[PDB]
Amino acid sequence: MNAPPAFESFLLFEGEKKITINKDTKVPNACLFTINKEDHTLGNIIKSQLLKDPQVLFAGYKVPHPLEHKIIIRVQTTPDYSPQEAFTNAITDLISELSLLEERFRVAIKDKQEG
């Protein structure tokens, strides 16, 4: 009667942007990234990778409503740095980490099956 289709958690609606960047006016060098059709899976890793950047002053995320299917990630960096650049570097670092983890898991599987 009121059950949303299960794909609405993963699929973007037509004309809906995957990610939107909005300047935070309260403090300088801060941005809000509203990412649609993602959840804690990417939010937590992006936040925790951003916390590894010493040029990042704030890194947090929230799912504003569990029934809704977006996350907001707030990133504040030092003045010489940018929150968009920080977010990009965090994603790049996560991708490199996962590539290395995948190659090493392939090697470990090969060793385990062989000996």
């Binding site: 010493p54 040029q55 002053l57 030092t78």
Partner: protein
């Protein structure tokens, strides 16, 4: 300098009333150079303190070695020379009370400055000469280091 008070204290008792909180412990200490009593709440989980220990306590208005006010905002990316480098345990709180033995006509011979470090409470009481730097609703730092 920005230092409101400095002395060496000796832990004379820990939790006289019993352990109230697991990770927090109340120390009742007394110094030797000024004869000031101290009640202090410390996170013993990260900075354990044993009975009979001896430490240097420095109540400061600022962490920067040069006279320079603080903004009360957390700036981890700060490369200035901070006096927290010379200490082990550092807290940041505010003075919320200054008692004394004053009368309606006489001034105070002994004062009692109360500070709250985000709920961890301290009372530094002794001669009023050593507590002129304390003013209510004023932010201070703890700057505490253990010595042998």
């Amino acid at each position: 300098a920005g230092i409101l008070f400095e002395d060496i204290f000796d832990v004379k008792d820990i939790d006289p009333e019993g352990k109230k909180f697991d990770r927090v412990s109340r120390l009742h200490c007394e110094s030797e150079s000024f004869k000031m009593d101290l009640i202090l709440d410390v996170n013993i989980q990260i900075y354990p303190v044993d009975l009979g220990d001896k430490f240097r306590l420095v109540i400061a208005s600022t962490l920067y070695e040069d006279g320079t006010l603080d903004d009360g905002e957390y700036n981890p990316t700060d490369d200035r020379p901070s006096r927290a480098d010379q200490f082990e345990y550092v807290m940041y709180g505010k003075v919320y009370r200054i008692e004394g033995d004053e009368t309606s006509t006489e001034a105070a011979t002994r004062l009692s400055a109360y500070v709250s470090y985000g709920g961890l409470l301290m009372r530094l009481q002794g001669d009023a000469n050593n507590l002129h730097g304390f003013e209510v609703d004023s932010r201070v730092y703890l700057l505490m280091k253990k010595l042998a």
